[PDB]
Amino acid sequence: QKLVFFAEXVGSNKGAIIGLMVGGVVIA
Amino acid sequence: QKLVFFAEXVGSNKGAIIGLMVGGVVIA
Amino acid sequence: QKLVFFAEXVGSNKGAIIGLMVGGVVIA
Amino acid sequence: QKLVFFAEXVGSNKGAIIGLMVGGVVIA
Amino acid sequence: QKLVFFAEXVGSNKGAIIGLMVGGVVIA
Amino acid sequence: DAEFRHXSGYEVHHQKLVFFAEXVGSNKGAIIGLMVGGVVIA
Amino acid sequence: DAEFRHXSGYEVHHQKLVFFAEXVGSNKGAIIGLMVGGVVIA
Amino acid sequence: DAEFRHXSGYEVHHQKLVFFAEXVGSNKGAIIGLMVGGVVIA
Amino acid sequence: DAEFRHXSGYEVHHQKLVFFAEXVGSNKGAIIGLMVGGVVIA
Amino acid sequence: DAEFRHXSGYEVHHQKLVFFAEXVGSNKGAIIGLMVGGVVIA
Amino acid sequence: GYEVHHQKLVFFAEXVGSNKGAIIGLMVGGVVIA
Amino acid sequence: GYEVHHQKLVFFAEXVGSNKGAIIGLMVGGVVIA
Amino acid sequence: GYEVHHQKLVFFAEXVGSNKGAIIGLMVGGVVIA
Amino acid sequence: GYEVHHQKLVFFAEXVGSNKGAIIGLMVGGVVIA
Amino acid sequence: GYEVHHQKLVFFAEXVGSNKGAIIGLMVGGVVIA
């Protein structure tokens, strides 16, 4: 699994980025 | 699984980006 | 599975982007 | 699993970035 | 698992970055 | 697995309420004698 | 696993309330004689 | 595992409340004779 | 494991309250005769 | 393991409160005759 | 000429509330992207 | 000419409330990206 | 000409409340990115 | 010509409240990145 | 010509309250990165 986040400017993350989710609880 | 997020300007994430979801609960 | 999200300007994510959904609950 | 976060400008993280989630609880 | 955080400018982290999450509770 | 659950139990009895209105003009909000729980958006 | 839970038990009884409104003009908010819990946005 | 929980037990009884409003003009906020818990955003 | 919990037990009884409003003009905040717990944002 | 917990037990009884309002114009904050606990942001 | 005397915008979301869009009480100019 | 006498924007989210967008009580100019 | 007499922006989040976006009581100019 | 007489921005978060974005009571100029 | 008579920015977080972003009572110029 290859994930790319290129943002020429204002690159921000406020949610949930998950390569693989097998279980558990994620709240963003 | 190759995922590309290119944003020339204002690139933001506030939801849920999941490459593979096998279980669990994800709330954005 | 190749996913491309190119946005020349204002690229934002607020929903759910899932390459493969096998189970669980995803609430955007 | 290769994850890239390149941001030419203002690159910030305020949410949840998880390579692999098997269990537990994550709140951003 | 290779995770890259390159930011040519202001690179900051205020959320939760987890290589592998098997258990426990994380609040960002 | 997430589990969301809520709600309330009300037990109201054996009460005497005298409601008298001799001069409420052009009311546009809320006029409540007695409010046990619930949501009021005036 | 996340578990969210709330809510309240109300037991109100044996009360005497006299409500008298002889001059409430152009009311635009909330006028509550008695409020036991709940949410009020006037 | 996270566990969020709240809520409040109310037991209000045996009270006498005389409410008299003879001059409340152009009210735009909250007028509460008595508030036991809850939220008021006037 | 995280565990968040709160809430308050209210037991209010045996009181006499006389509320008299003969001159409250253009109120935009909160006018509370008595407040036991809770949140008030005037 | 983290454990967060709070809340307060209120037991208010046997009081006499005379609230008299004759000259409160253009109020924009809080006018509370008696406050037991809670949060007031005037 | 514009005049707003009273305006209320109440958002009561008892559950999994959210707002992914703009909530503008009075829009006159500029650009709002949400 | 603009005049706003009273304005309220109440956001009561008793659960998992959130705001991923803009909440502007009065917008006149500029750019707001949320 | 702009004149705001009363304005309230109340945010009551009794749970896992959050704000990932802008909350602007009066926007006149500039750029707000959230 | 801008004049604000009263303004309130109340934030009551009785839980896991947080703010990842801007909370501006009056924005006139400049750039705010959050 | 800008004039603010009364302003309040109250942040009541009875729990795990936090602020990862900017809280500006009056923004006129400069750059704020949060």
Swiss-Prot record, chains K, L, M, N, O:
The record marks G25 as: Implicated in free radical propagation. The record marks M27 as: Susceptible to oxidation. Residues 16-34 are annotated as: Interaction with PSEN1. Zn(2+) 2 binds at Y2, H5, H6. It comes from the Eukaryota. Changing E14K: In CAA-APP; Italian type. It is found in: Cell surface. Changing Y2F: 60-70% zinc-induced amyloid-beta protein 28 aggregation. Changing L26V: In CAA-APP; Italian type. Changing E14Q: In CAA-APP; Dutch type. Cu(2+) 2 binds at Y2, H5, H6. The record marks K8, L9, F11, F12, V32, I33 as: Cleavage. Glycans are attached at Y2. Interacts with FPR2. More effective reductant than amyloid-beta protein 40. May activate mononuclear phagocytes in the brain and elicit inflammatory responses. This is Amyloid-beta protein 42. It comes from Homo sapiens (Human). The gene is APP. The chain holds residues 680 to 713 of 770 of the full protein.
